[PDB]
């Protein structure tokens, strides 16, 4: 019954449903800032401050190599150990790449900040072209674990057109 990291690390496609309910966020983890920036140029690509998101990017996005994600979040009454996210990006259900970010320990009622780095998988001119030409068939699942137990699940899709 409890979903762990090794379960999601084998996923063959975007999940057809959410693997948990909003009520399984018993730690009351609450994101209050999310920012991604291009590591080459230093440019901010997207910032949001204070379970599905659709992004609309340009073709140039697909030529990035490395992107930094800063996150700020608060936690409620219980301590949070080994907070971790595994986020899997697919095109038409073929894995593009799976990222695995560790956030560590958070004391109760804290706000915490981390920055992690996405390294792009290698993409071929064919693949890119297909990606540009098929908006929103690139999708991602974000799986959030506390102490190896799934507590949140967010979905996203992407256009590069």
């Amino acid at each position: 019954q409890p979903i762990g990291p090794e379960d999601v690390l084998g996923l063959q496609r975007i999940t057809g449903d959410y693997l948990c309910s909003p009520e399984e966020n018993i730690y009351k983890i609450d994101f209050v800032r999310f920012k991604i920036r291009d590591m080459d140029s230093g440019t901010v690509l997207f910032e949001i401050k204070k379970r599905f998101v659709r992004y609309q990017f340009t073709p140039a996005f697909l030529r990035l190599r490395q992107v930094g994600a800063t996150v700020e979040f608060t936690v409620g009454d219980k301590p949070v150990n080994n907070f971790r996210m595994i986020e899997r990006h697919y095109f038409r259900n073929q894995l593009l790449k799976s990222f695995d970010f560790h956030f560590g320990f958070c004391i109760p009622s804290s706000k915490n900040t981390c920055e992690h780095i996405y390294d792009f998988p290698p993409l071929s001119e064919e693949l890119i072209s297909e990606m540009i030409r098929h908006p929103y068939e690139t999708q991602s699942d974000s799986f959030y674990f506390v102490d190896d137990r799934l507590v949140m699940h967010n979905k996203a899709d992407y256009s590069y057109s």
């Binding site: 609450d30 994101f31 209050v32 800032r33 999310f34 997207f46 949001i48 401050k49 204070k50 379970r51 599905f52 998101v53 992004y55 994600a69 996150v71 996210m85 986020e87 991602s140 699942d141 974000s142 949140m152 967010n154 979905k155 996203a156």
Partner: peptide, 6 residues
């Protein structure tokens, strides 16, 4: 995906 949560 984390942007969903704000």
């Amino acid at each position: 995906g984390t942007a969903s949560s704000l």
